[PDB]
């Protein structure tokens, strides 16, 4: 059982404190006592015995990890982090939506133990947490924070410099924007996800899904699309071509991006049928 200092009693700070208090003690700090009171009344009653609410920083030196979730502004984050870094040598973790971790890190005195920890909303519900490292972050700090988050029951992905989730959301939104400008209804953009792509990417991911499509199929299909249209997004990737030269063409060969057993196709359909039934889309 560790003690975690959480800076900022807004929605995200409050949620992080709830997620952590399941297993650890928390100190939740905010300069506003009104924010602390509002937070307290939103926290499950059983967890209140594990959370100290405060306006000051004296408990920072007693904590094993600091999580910062203040306003999304470079100078504000730098200011709070520079204050806390003098009080402790613990890992310092900014919940940063889009502010660059490298831009923050380069303004700290001791950036080797600073990194980004990107929680999803609500932090205590959603399983994914991304660790976003700067060029300064050391390996020990990553492994410590990764272990902490994993032991909390989170699914952890470590990213360099930028969030992978933000990257994928922007790539999808950029394409959706093209469709919107072309005249595609928003509802239809969403329906191709809600009734198809979201299901496949949920169960298999986009790369796992590719194995079932067939890596050979995908390379020649994307290549045709590139030669026909020829949007950059269709351009056939180099990593894919090494796979096809190896005969690692997917589920049909028992190996593509991943390795498969004989019942893979049958299991795919079983899992999709189950998800469709659950969602009421059967």
Gap between the Cα atoms of 155 and 126, Å rounded = 9
Gap between the Cα atoms of 212 and 210, Å rounded = 5
Q: Which stretch binds a second copy (CB under 8 A): 24-32, 60-68, 133-141, 176-184?
A: 176-184
Is 184 a binding residue for a second copy by CB under 8 A? The answer is yes
Q: Where are the alpha helices (DSSP H) in the chain?
A: 11-21, 33-42, 74-85, 101-105, 139-151, 164-182, 186-192, 198-203, 205-213, 215-229, 238-245, 264-279
**Residues 221-280 within binding reach of a second copy (CB under 8 A):** 221-222, 224-225, 228-229, 231-235, 237-240, 257-258, 269, 272-273, 275-276, 278-279
Residue 30 marked in a binding site: yes
- Secondary structure (3-state) at 75: helix
Q: Which stretch binds a second copy (CB under 8 A): 58-66, 81-89, 143-151, 216-224?
A: 216-224
- Choose, by CB under 5 A, the member of 35, 57, 156, 159 that binds Cl ion: 57
- Choose, by CB under 8 A, the member of 171, 246, 247, 259 that binds a second copy: 171
Q: Which stretch binds a second copy (CB under 8 A): 2-10, 52-60, 77-85, 172-180?
A: 172-180
Is 193 a binding residue for a second copy by CB under 8 A? The answer is yes
**Residues 193-222 within binding reach of Cl ion (CB under 5 A):** none
Size of the site for a second copy (CB under 8 A): 88
CB 39 within 8 A of CB 14: yes
Among Cl ion, a second copy, none, what binds residue 57 when CB lies within 5 to 8 Å by partner kind? Cl ion
Is 56 a binding residue for Cl ion by CB under 5 A? The answer is yes
Ordered DSSP codes for 198-224: HHHHHHTHHHHHHHHH-HHHHHHHHHH
**Residues 94-133 within binding reach of a second copy (CB under 8 A):** 97-100, 103, 120, 122, 125-128, 130
Among a second copy, Cl ion, none, what binds residue 280 when CB lies within 5 to 8 Å by partner kind? none
Among Cl ion, a second copy, none, what binds residue 202 when CB lies within 5 to 8 Å by partner kind? a second copy
Q: How many CB atoms lie within 10 A of CB 184?
A: 13
Helix pair angle (264-279, 205-213), 10° resolution: 130
Gap between the Cα atoms of 234 and 226, Å rounded = 5
Residue 231 marked in a binding site: no
Please, which residue, 49 or 56, has the CB nearer to Cl ion?
Answer: 56
Q: Give how far Cα 54 sits from Cα of 31, 69, 88, 116, Å.
A: 8, 15, 17, 23
Is 143 a binding residue for a second copy by CB under 8 A? The answer is no
Is 27 a binding residue for Cl ion by CB under 5 A? The answer is no
Closest C-alpha among 52, 47, 131 to residue 93 = 131
Minimum CB–partner distance for residue 111 and Cl ion (Å): 22
C-alpha 210, offset from chain centre = 22
Residues tagged in the binding site annotation for NAD(+) = 8-13, 30, 72, 77, 97, 121, 252
Residues tagged in the binding site annotation = 8-13, 30, 72, 77, 97, 121, 252
């Amino acid at each position: 059982h560790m003690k975690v200092f959480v800076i900022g009693a807004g929605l995200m700070g409050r949620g992080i404190a709830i997620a952590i208090a399941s297993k650890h003690e928390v100190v939740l700090q905010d300069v506003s006592e009104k924010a602390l009171e509002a937070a307290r009344e939103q926290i499950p009653e059983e967890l209140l015995s594990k959370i100290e609410f405060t306006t000051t920083l004296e408990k920072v030196k007693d904590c094993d990890i600091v999580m910062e979730a203040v306003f999304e502004d470079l100078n504000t984050k730098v200011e709070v982090l520079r204050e806390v870094e003098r009080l402790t040598n613990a890992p310092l973790c900014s919940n940063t939506s889009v502010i660059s971790v490298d831009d923050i890190a380069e303004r700290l005195d001791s950036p080797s133990r600073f990194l980004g920890v990107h929680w999803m909303n609500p932090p205590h519900v959603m399983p994914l947490v991304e660790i976003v490292i700067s060029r300064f972050t050391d390996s020990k700090t990553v492994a410590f924070v990764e272990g902490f988050l994993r032991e909390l029951g989170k699914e952890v992905v470590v990213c360099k410099g930028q969030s992978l989730v933000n990257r994928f959301n922007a790539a999808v939104l950029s394409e959706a924007s093209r469709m919107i400008e072309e005249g595609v209804r928003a509802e239809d953009v969403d329906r191709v996800w809600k009734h198809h792509l979201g299901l496949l990417y949920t169960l298999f991911g986009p790369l796992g899904n590719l194995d079932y499509i067939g890596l050979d199929v995908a390379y020649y299909a994307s290549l045709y699309l590139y030669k026909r249209f020829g949007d950059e997004k269709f351009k056939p990737p180099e990593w894919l071509q090494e796979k096809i030269k190896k005969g690692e063409v997917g589920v049909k060969a028992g190996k593509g991006i991943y390795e498969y057993g004989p019942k893979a196709y049958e299991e795919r359909v079983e899992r999709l049928k189950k998800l469709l039934r659950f969602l009421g889309l059967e």
